[PDB]
Amino acid sequence: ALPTIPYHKLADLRYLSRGASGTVSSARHADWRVQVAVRHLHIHTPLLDSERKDVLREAEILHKARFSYILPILGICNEPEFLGIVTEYMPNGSLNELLHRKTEYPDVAWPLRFRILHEIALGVNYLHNMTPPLLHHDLKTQNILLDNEFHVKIADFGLSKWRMMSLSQSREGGTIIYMPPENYEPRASIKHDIYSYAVITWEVLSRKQPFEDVTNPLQIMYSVSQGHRPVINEESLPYDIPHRARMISLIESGWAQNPDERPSFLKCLIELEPVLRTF
């Protein structure tokens, strides 16, 4: 039930960014007369009938996700030399930008930070409650996209066989700060996303870069496999943070070394719901 958008309907392709999962461009849809984003791959090697139908079936599965805080797939661009995922364009970039561009936003109020946290949690919760469940497996501040009025849309969920394609078209690497230590030695584990969520939650409340001072990413990887985490004290997480106790609980249970110890997103929601009634 996933539409095919022909290449020619996407005008004014401006490059925005590239990573493991391909290139991100803005475009104008010629018929809808709105802006769209497109994640795409220029495919160098020809691509087997088996391998193409795989990526399409994935995209078709991911198309089924329709929820307020999920960035929905609008259609697939399926060209001989070009594969593309067309999504709504998000004017305000990512959560990454809202937190760390401290010049452009000197002040990110508590009610907003907490609404973001709630919406991420509702998003991943929805994803996990699909049949079959849809796991994100690369949740990070860059995927948490912000619409015109700073509401959350989670992007790039379930891009598994897609990411193996942009692997193939090489013959660099994405951030590991939100990756649970089990995953370092490659899996199908429901408790991956909650680890990421926990690190995100730390980042949202601290407004600090996780492992900021640690220069080598392998250093980070060793540290966390030995159970080290972003530091929780008065400097990183000030005493004035609303519901500080409850949030630290959520964070620590979230990034627990043992997967079994980590909450479901339903558990986050139950815990968060009281916090939000404050605002």
Author numbering: 9 to 179, 186 to 200, 205 to 297
Lines quoted from the article behind this entry:
NOD1 and NOD2 (Nucleotide-binding oligomerization domain-containing proteins 1 and 2) are cytosolic receptors of the innate immune system, which respond to intracellular fragments of the bacterial peptidoglycans, D-glutamyl-meso-diaminopimelic acid (iE-DAP) and muramyl dipeptide (MPD), respectively. RIP2 also contains an N-terminal dual-specificity ser/tyr kinase domain (RIP2K), which belongs to the TKL kinase family (Tyrosine kinase-like).
RIP2KK47R crystallized in a different space group (P212121) with two quasi two-fold dimers (denoted AB and CD) per asymmetric unit and the structure was refined at 2.6 Å resolution. The inactive state of RIP2K resembles the Src/CDK-like inactive conformation, with the DFG motif in the IN state and the Helix αC outwardly displaced. Helix αC has rotated by ~17 degrees out from its active state position (calculated using the anglebetweenhelices command in Pymol). Due to the consequent rotation of Leu70, the R-spine is broken. Density for almost all the AS was visible showing that it is structured as an α-helix, as described for the inactive states of EGFR-KD and CDK2 and the monomeric BRAF. The AS helix encompasses residues 167–178, thus including the phosphorylation sites Ser174, Ser176 and Ser178 while residues 180–184 remain disordered. Interestingly the helical AS from monomer A in the AB dimer projects outwards towards the active site of the asymmetrically related monomer C from the CD dimer, forming a putative substrate-enzyme phosphorylation complex. Despite the fact that ADP was added in the crystallisation buffer, no nucleotide is bound, probably due to the bulky arginine blocking the ATP binding site and the sulphate rich crystallisation medium. Thus, the asymmetric unit of the RIP2KK47R crystal shows two quasi 2-fold symmetric dimers, with a slightly altered and weaker dimer interface at the N-termini than is observed in the active state.
